[PDB]
Structure 1
Amino acid sequence: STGSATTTPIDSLDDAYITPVQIGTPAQTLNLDFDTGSSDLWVFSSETTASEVDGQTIYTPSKSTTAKLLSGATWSISYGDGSSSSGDVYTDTVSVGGLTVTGQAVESAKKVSSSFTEDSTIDGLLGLAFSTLNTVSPTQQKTFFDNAKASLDSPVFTADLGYHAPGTYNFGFIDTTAYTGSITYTAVSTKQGFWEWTSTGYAVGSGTFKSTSIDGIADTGTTLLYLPATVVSAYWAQVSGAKSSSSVGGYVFPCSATLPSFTFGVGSARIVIPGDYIDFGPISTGSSSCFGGIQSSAGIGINIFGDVALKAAFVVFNGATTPTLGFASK
């Protein structure tokens, strides 16, 4: 089997991407944030504290003939941005782009933090990291991909995120029309539960490539590119007037700037992020200070190849017995 679904930016900045997901019988379609940095499929629901729902579409398990309470199971998750959610668990039928999994754990939120409430466009998350990170207790649950894997034509999924445009998540096949040149594969460590890999270096604009190992995670659920302070300083030093602002929470730059590109290495291959991808616009409405899309990972504890990086590539998440990651230009 295979599946193919379009993923759409939630706003004009590509802050996140939503993908329609069918849950239950008859189908309830919710727009979920596919997140290769976590491993829980959770949804706003009829159980979510009413004051914490503001415009989201909810899953109502009592209206699904295939929903079953997973008795005794609870979940609770906290994300890198400080947001969180928790609740109980149902199993139900879940379909993505025509690919169906029966008995998928659908984690129903009883509580969500303010950041989730305040974003009416995201109805929940669909985790695509390794199932070892799943938070369901006392019986850990598998991700949608893990459950689908054996049925897939090939044990892979691909992320093809757009810049200010829709893109695609495919399951079970590699669309050879969706990228240019060849795909370069690189080793993955699953030791921390992430799609963790080592970039071979970087360049800023038309500058020379610096060969240096940068361990980080491929994370579709993180908006920006978070890299070591040395690398980030080298990038922003090429933008007149750019500076790190503790008050704003990272590097800002004059909105009048033209940003240089940023290249990262994948083995001997190179992925070029155009400068425009690094512009996250005014820090507040009407400001002439703009927020940068490359930020320091210092104090996160891990480097994160988030959407800014991933959307410059066609990315293969190869879930074979020994997982790997593939990157192609597009």
Structure 2
Amino acid sequence: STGSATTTPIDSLDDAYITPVQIGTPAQTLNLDFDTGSSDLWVFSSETTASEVDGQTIYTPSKSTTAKLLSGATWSISYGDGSSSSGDVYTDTVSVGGLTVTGQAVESAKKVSSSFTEDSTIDGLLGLAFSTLNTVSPTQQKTFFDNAKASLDSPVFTADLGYHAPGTYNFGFIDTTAYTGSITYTAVSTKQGFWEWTSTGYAVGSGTFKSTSIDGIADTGTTLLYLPATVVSAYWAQVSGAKSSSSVGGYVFPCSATLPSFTFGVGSARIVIPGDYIDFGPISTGSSSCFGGIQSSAGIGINIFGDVALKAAFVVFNGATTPTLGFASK
């Protein structure tokens, strides 16, 4: 089997991407944030504290003939931006782009933090990291991809995120029309439960490539590119007037600037992020200070190849017995 679904930016800055997912019988379609940095499929629901729902579409298990309470199971998760959610668990039929999994753990939110409430366009998350990170207790549950894997034509999914435009998540096949040149594959460590790999280095603009190992995670659920302070300083030093602002929470730059590109290495191959992808617009409405899309990972404890990086590439998440990651230009 295979599946293919369009993923759409939630706003004009590509702050996140949502993908329609069919849950239950008859189908209830919710728009979920596919997140290769976590492993829980959770949704706004009929059980979510009413004051914490503001415009989201909810899953109502009582209206699904295939929903079953997973007795005794609870979940609770916190994300890297400080947001969180928790609740109980059902199993139900879940389909993505024509690919169906029966008995998928669908984690129903009883509580969500303020930033989720404030995000009316995101109805939940669909985790695509390794199932070892799944938070369900006392019986850990599998991700959608892990449940689907055996049935897939090939044990892979791909992320093809658009810049200010829709893109695609495919399951079970590699669309050879969706990228240019060849796909370069690179080793993955699953030791921390992430799609963790090592970039071979970077360049800023038309500058020379610096060969240096940068360990980090391919994380579709993180908006920006978070890299070591040395690398980030070298980038922003090429933008007149750019500075790190503790009050804003990162590097900002004059909105009048033309940003340089940023290149990262994948083995001997190179992925180029155009300068425009690094612009996240005014820090507040009407401001001439703009927020940067490359930020320091110092304090996070891990480097994160988020959407800013991933959207410059066609990315293969290879879930073979020994997982790997593939990157191609597009």
Distance across 1 between alignment mates of 2:72 and 2:218? 33
The Cα shift of 1:244 comes to 0.1
Distance across 1 between alignment mates of 2:321 and 2:80? 28
Distance across 2 between alignment mates of 1:303 and 1:235? 15
The Cα shift of 1:323 comes to 0.1
The Cα shift of 1:104 comes to 0.0
Residue deviations 1:79-119, cap 9 Å, x none?
00000000000000000000000000000000000000000
* Stretches (4+) displaced over 2 A: none
Residue deviations 1:3-26, cap 9 Å, x none?
000000000000000000000000
Residue deviations 1:40-62, cap 9 Å, x none?
00000000000000000000000
2:182 is aligned to: 182
The Cα shift of 1:152 comes to 0.1
1:167 is aligned to: 167
Distance across 2 between alignment mates of 1:78 and 1:285? 29
The Cα shift of 1:326 comes to 0.1
2:195 is aligned to: 195
1:46 is aligned to: 46
Secondary structure of the residue that 1:235 maps to in structure 2? helix
Secondary structure of the residue that 2:111 maps to in structure 1? strand
Secondary structure of the residue that 1:173 maps to in structure 2? coil
Distance across 2 between alignment mates of 1:177 and 1:319? 21
Distance across 2 between alignment mates of 1:81 and 1:190? 22
Distance across 1 between alignment mates of 2:100 and 2:194? 24
Q: How many residues align?
A: 330
Runs of 5+ unmatched residues, structure 1: none
Distance across 1 between alignment mates of 2:315 and 2:176? 12
Distance across 2 between alignment mates of 1:198 and 1:115? 31
Residue deviations 1:301-330, cap 9 Å, x none?
000000000000000000000000000000
The Cα shift of 1:233 comes to 0.0
The Cα shift of 1:31 comes to 0.0
The Cα shift of 1:133 comes to 0.0
The Cα shift of 1:211 comes to 0.0
Residue deviations 1:275-311, cap 9 Å, x none?
0000000000000000000000000000000000000
Distance across 2 between alignment mates of 1:249 and 1:78? 20
Q: What TM-score do the two structures reach when normalised by structure 2?
A: 1.00
Distance across 2 between alignment mates of 1:115 and 1:210? 38
Secondary structure of the residue that 2:175 maps to in structure 1? coil
Distance across 2 between alignment mates of 1:214 and 1:81? 22
The Cα shift of 1:210 comes to 0.0
Secondary structure of the residue that 1:47 maps to in structure 2? coil
% same residue: 100
The Cα shift of 1:194 comes to 0.0
Q: What TM-score do the two structures reach when normalised by structure 1?
A: 1.00
How well do the aligned residues superpose, as a CA RMSD in angstroms?
A: 0.1
The Cα shift of 1:37 comes to 0.0
1:135 is aligned to: 135
2:97 is aligned to: 97
Runs of 5+ unmatched residues, structure 2: none
Distance across 2 between alignment mates of 1:312 and 1:131? 27
Residue deviations 1:190-227, cap 9 Å, x none?
00000000000000000000000000000000000000
Distance across 1 between alignment mates of 2:292 and 2:82? 20
Distance across 2 between alignment mates of 1:270 and 1:151? 33
Distance across 2 between alignment mates of 1:9 and 1:304? 19
The Cα shift of 1:148 comes to 0.1
Residue deviations 1:157-191, cap 9 Å, x none?
00000000000000000000000000000000000
Distance across 1 between alignment mates of 2:74 and 2:86? 8
